[PDB]
């Protein structure tokens, strides 16, 4: 296969952290790439399943999506792809640059990732596991989509009766819509998993967090209607999200924390 690389072409420079499947690395390919490279321990995946899953990483081609560069499919097995340097957009949020994000960056992140996702619809396929600790991020805020597939993300007819669907992903885009206003914090604070299902089901929603515009929080609802083919498309995310401070809200004036 193509994807092949052979093995002295990596160098594994930086540890990163923990990966989905196994741990990370920034390194460098070919002497003169900057990569990011993931290691998995021999036990956890065979040859043969790896290359089902890979084949995923290898058909999609997108600039909001985590572009796969090379592989080593042998066990121990390497997985090669383009280094996000500020990591998850999860830590992205919590950590130092949190306080200087205001809304107008908040939302153009919610729009590159509605972006992604919408590249997503349109090859039918489905992430099922759209989180904040699921994107990276890179160089000038760019936020790319990973890791494609935690109840308090999921959407109530995948997680009840197992309906994975773009509509699925659309509710999680909701629920990631609040980690962002939120700078970061657990969905449903103060509520375990077990609670939040039983909520949900009874027409529970997560109110207007703090200084986010009633506007925004009313497209969150849209995400989480209970009908899911009420849920609007990723298509739209997207242009409302690039287009919401002239359409939506053309009066937004900055504040203490957004
Ligand atoms: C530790 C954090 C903050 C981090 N994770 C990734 C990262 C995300 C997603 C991937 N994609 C991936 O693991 N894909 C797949 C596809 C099919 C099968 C398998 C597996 F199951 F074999 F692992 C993995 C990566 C791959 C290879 C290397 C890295 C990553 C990156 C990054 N790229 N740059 C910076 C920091 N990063």
Redesign the pocket.
């Known amino acids: 296969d193509a994807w092949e690389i052979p093995r002295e072409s990596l160098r594994l420079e930086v540890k990163?952290?923990?990966?989905?499947?196994?741990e990370?690395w920034?390194g460098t390919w070919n002497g003169t790439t900057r990569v990011?490279?993931?290691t998995?321990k021999p036990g956890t995946?065979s040859p043969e399943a790896?290359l089902q899953?890979?084949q995923?990483?290898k058909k999609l081609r997108h600039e909001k999506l985590?572009q796969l560069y090379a592989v080593v499919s042998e066990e121990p097995?390497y997985?090669?792809?383009?280094?996000?340097?500020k990591?998850?957009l999860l830590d992205f949020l919590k950590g130092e640059m949190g306080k200087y994000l205001r809304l107008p960056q908040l939302v153009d992140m919610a729009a590159q990732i509605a972006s992604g996702m919408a590249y997503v619809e349109r090859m039918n396929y489905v992430h099922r596991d759209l989180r904040a600790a699921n994107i990276?991020v890179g160089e000038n805020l760019v936020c790319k989509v990973?890791?494609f597939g935690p109840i308090k993300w999921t959407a109530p007819e995948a997680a009840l009766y197992g309906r994975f669907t773009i509509k699925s992903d659309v509710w999680s885009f909701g629920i990631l819509l609040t980690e962002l206003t939120t700078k970061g914090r657990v969905p449903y604070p103060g509520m375990v998993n077990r609670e939040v299902l039983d909520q949900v089901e009874r027409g529970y929603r997560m109110p207007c967090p703090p200084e986010c515009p009633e506007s925004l929080h009313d497209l969150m609802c849209q995400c989480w209607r209970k009908d899911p083919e009420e849920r609007p498309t990723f298509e739209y995310l997207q242009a409302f999200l690039e287009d919401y401070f002239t359409s939506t809200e053309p009066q937004y004036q900055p504040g203490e924390n957004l």
Do not use: H, N, R, W
């Not at 990163?16 to 196994?22: A, H």
């Not at 997985?79 to 340097?85: A, Q, R």
């Open positions: 990163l952290g923990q990966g989905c499947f196994g990370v920034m990011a490279i993931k998995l995946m790896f899953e890979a995923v990483m985590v097995i997985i090669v792809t383009e280094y996000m340097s990591g998850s990276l990973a890791d």
